[PDB]
Ligand binder design. Structure first.
Ligand code: CL
Ligand code: NA
Length: 129
């Protein structure tokens, strides 16, 4: 699926991601545009043999199990495939472990390179609040 834009904020706003660990909703939503262009089925290889899955491009080394990433820790106890679901629960739930891991949203390189320091409210502007 693909999401519209307000359309994700509300889910993201349901599942408890607004000011989750002080990150307002524009930060998540902004992460989801640039990680995946708003697409639950998104998958991209990384150079280390790992792959990133779904709306927030979560990673098979550390976070999920894809069976091809020799040393995976499956720190969300989960199959990486389950995170491509049109139901963002597993992604948002895993995303809430990651962000709580040390480095905050800097765990998402497109957040750092593209959201951080920018007025992340333009991403929730026009959403019915
Ligand atoms: Cl932080
Ligand atoms: Na893994």
């Amino acid at each position: 699926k693909v999401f519209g834009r307000c359309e994700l904020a509300a889910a993201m706003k349901r599942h408890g991601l607004d000011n989750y660990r002080g990150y307002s909703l524009g930060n998540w939503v902004c992460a989801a545009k640039f990680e995946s262009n708003f697409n639950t089925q998104a998958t991209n290889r990384n150079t280390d043999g790992s792959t990133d899955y779904g709306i927030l491009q979560i990673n098979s080394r550390w976070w999920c199990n894809d069976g091809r990433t020799p040393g995976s820790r499956n720190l969300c106890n989960i199959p990486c495939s389950a995170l491509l679901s049109s139901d963002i629960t597993a992604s948002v739930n895993c995303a809430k472990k990651i962000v709580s891991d040390g480095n905050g949203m800097n765990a998402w390189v497109a957040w750092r390179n593209r959201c951080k320091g920018t007025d992340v409210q333009a991403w929730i502007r026009g959403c019915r609040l």
